[PDB]
Symmetry: D3
Amino acid sequence: TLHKERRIGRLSVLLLLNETQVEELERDGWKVCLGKVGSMDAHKVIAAIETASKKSGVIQSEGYRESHALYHATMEALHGVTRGEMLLGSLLRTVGLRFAVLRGNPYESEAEGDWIAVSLYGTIGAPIKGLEHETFGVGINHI
Amino acid sequence: TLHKERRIGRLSVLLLLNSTQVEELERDGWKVCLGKVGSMDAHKVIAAIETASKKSGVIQSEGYRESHALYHATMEALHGVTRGEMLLGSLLRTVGLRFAVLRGNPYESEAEGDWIAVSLYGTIGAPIKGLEHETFGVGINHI
Amino acid sequence: TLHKERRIGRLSVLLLLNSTQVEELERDGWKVCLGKVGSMDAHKVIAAIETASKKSGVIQSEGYRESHALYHATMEALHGVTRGEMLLGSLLRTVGLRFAVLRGNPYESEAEGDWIAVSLYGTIGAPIKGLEHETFGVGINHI
Amino acid sequence: TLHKERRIGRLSVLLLLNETQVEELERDGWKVCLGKVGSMDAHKVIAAIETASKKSGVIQSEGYRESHALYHATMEALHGVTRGEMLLGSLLRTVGLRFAVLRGNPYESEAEGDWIAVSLYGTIGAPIKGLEHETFGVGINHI
Amino acid sequence: TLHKERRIGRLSVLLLLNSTQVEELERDGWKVCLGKVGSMDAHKVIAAIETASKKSGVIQSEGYRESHALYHATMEALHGVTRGEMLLGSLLRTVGLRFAVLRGNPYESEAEGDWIAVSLYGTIGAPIKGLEHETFGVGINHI
Amino acid sequence: TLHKERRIGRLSVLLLLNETQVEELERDGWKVCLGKVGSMDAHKVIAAIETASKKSGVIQSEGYRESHALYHATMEALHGVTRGEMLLGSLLRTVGLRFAVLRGNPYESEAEGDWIAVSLYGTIGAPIKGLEHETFGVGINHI
RNA sequence: UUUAGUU
RNA sequence: UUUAGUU
RNA sequence: UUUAGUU
RNA sequence: UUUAGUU
RNA sequence: UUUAGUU
RNA sequence: UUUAGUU
Ligand SMILES: N[C@@H](Cc1c[nH]c[nH+]1)C(=O)O
Ligand SMILES: N[C@@H](Cc1c[nH]c[nH+]1)C(=O)O
Ligand SMILES: N[C@@H](Cc1c[nH]c[nH+]1)C(=O)O
Ligand SMILES: N[C@@H](Cc1c[nH]c[nH+]1)C(=O)O
Ligand SMILES: N[C@@H](Cc1c[nH]c[nH+]1)C(=O)O
Ligand SMILES: N[C@@H](Cc1c[nH]c[nH+]1)C(=O)O
Ligand SMILES: [Mg+2]
Ligand SMILES: [Mg+2]
Ligand SMILES: [Mg+2]
Ligand SMILES: [Mg+2]
Ligand SMILES: [Mg+2]
Ligand SMILES: [Mg+2]
């Protein structure tokens, strides 16, 4: 069962929606990294999240296993952001995002191992400043 | 442009993850609605959100206009929750959700009128207590 | 290339939005079928179109070949009607449709053989009379 | 309920499928604009529709509200045209379209306000003239 | 990199299209599971695969971790079977399937841990014996 | 009903998963062609399959009919390979594939005519050698 | 409408 | 990788 | 198969 | 923005 | 969990 | 058309 005080999803969102906390999370044994990326190319968003996650040590830079887990978590978070079509520029829209990647075990059973959450928050709109609204996305996966 | 102090998406999410914070929101002119629904039928989730919204006065009970706006905002929030297939029970999964519906103008220009945000947070998993993880979804629309 | 006077898609739509215009079409060699179905179950819409098509002789009742072509044409028309999720009742929505199935060769070359067009027009909305708007869909396939 | 003689969807399609009518619609209080665009890039289709709609006065050029309503209506019409994947050139296909955008209140109740319909008709096929078939799409949204 | 002699996807498919080839696989360290299910309800297909996998010991019966990995692998295999809409009966179609679940490390590096492959082969068609064609699906995930 | 020894889908897969056989199939009256293509652009995969199929005589190079049947069969096979989003490079992923296209009548009734199967097998992953796993896809259509 | 659940 | 943008 | 509908 | 196009 | 099915 | 690739 999900440990009420280790809800990886909720924690990653709160961190993202409040501009320290990283330090408190790390003290709790969590692996975290924060970043920002804006683009009309989804691959640039994906790349930024992976590159920040590997450089901050949230996931191993060697091997495929963890990169695979992160890719799919990112894909799931992008569903919330794109809502139907995982396309940005080709559909004449752009995104400005802030992201957080959190890694650790959110369950009461230590046997569940590590899980990873990718959270995204920002704006999506036409390529004109102001012609936009907020967007959110959260993807969760096992490691 | 979006008003920093009136970010409807972020505000609805913070309320959902939290005292009548509703009072503060309402004092600032926002129409707010909070609820909870769990089911293996997406239509029940959709119905709960609509019913709570109309009863609480977040949207007009009469006419189609506002119901149309809410329906589509709900659809967009469901994308974040379902991530690919807007199906629950038919794909052997269930959801336990908490939801918030916020209505008001998040832009600096009063000419942008009212917008609506539907936010969802909870768990999705196999029909077995514990075999689940967190899920999130936010949909925004003009109304 | 498509024959200007034999544009199967346009012709099926004009018939649907309209006298035995069917007679004229049939006189020109077209196999025509007209019907109406309303439901919160997509399978019922699909079944009505197939049944009407085979009874009216628009497609062979025997074999799979032609049923396969019609099924996929129906699927494509349903995309225009559902726009994203090929779901009706499970997403708390209902459809009231009028449909037309036209069969014949729309190209200048007789070697292109027969093609089939499934056109749909009606309303889609919440399960409440009035809380709805128009919906449209056209699917085209070789047969 | 939908006013039988103000069916915005049907009207926009008929206008599109019959090469005046614009004048008659405008006399009835409707806002209309007709255009044509062909491309292997969906964003060019979207851009043409928005640019023609704002220059013809169908939607306000200032603010986001109406641009947002039009974008989503265009997205919905594109579902009918693309049928599954909102991709053109990346899936080795091209489209040649004629489009119509109609704005007004299609309901009996004046309280329903303005709604907008984006209708598309043309051909989609491989990037070779002749290797194509018809395509249609209609999206409807509130303003 | 993937080990030429341990290509989990290819091996699971060859087994499905074939003696205890299972014995050879098991002798090489693979955890194998074979089954068959037919239905117009995707959840039944999903359930059969999970139940057979846990009973045969392909994945842990306890905890969520491994069930989560299997669920997503099953979802991915279902994409190949359904091709667009992960729906069976609601779209008036039925499936008759044979399935295989293989678990083990397909890479040269032992650090990649275990991965799981879900393969499906059978027929999909209208609810009439004969009006059908073959269908295939393979999903791969880390576990 | 499907002829047990003329299962076009199974046959195309076996041919693809075992490095002659083409000769045996051709002797049985089958039309076959094998190829390989790798890319981060789906259109290049589609193009390679069409170009190899027309040059090997699996489908007629003249007219649209057969090209249309092949395009849709290829689209269906790509669903198995992409699993949700028919995107490669835009989602920061690449594919290395081997493909087979088989043409003939897989049914017991000679009246069912010719059908076509497009089968794909290879790897999909991040654009780094090794960071990948297997992928499969099979599409079947009537001619 | 006032959080779901077993193959 | 250290938030995008004009038809 | 001969247009649907309430949380 | 004033219909696209070759593997 | 040990292959489905009629408008 | 005669298997792709670095943020
Ligand atoms: N409103 C769009 C973004 C957009 C594009 N153009 C204008 N707005 C969305 O929901 O993603
Ligand atoms: N993991 C699934 C939910 C689930 C179903 N069964 C087990 N888990 C999801 O992401 O939606
Ligand atoms: N507006 C929805 C239909 C609907 C459901 N509830 C209200 N309206 C659509 O576009 O399909
Ligand atoms: N027939 C495809 C278009 C196409 C691409 N290549 C050949 N035809 C469609 O339905 O969109
Ligand atoms: N042809 C459909 C199945 C089907 C339904 N009805 C007839 N056939 C498919 O590809 O899934
Ligand atoms: N694992 C992805 C491919 C990938 C992209 N990056 C890393 N892997 C898939 O299933 O398609
Ligand atoms: Mg993967
Ligand atoms: Mg709508
Ligand atoms: Mg089929
Ligand atoms: Mg929007
Ligand atoms: Mg999951
Ligand atoms: Mg087509």
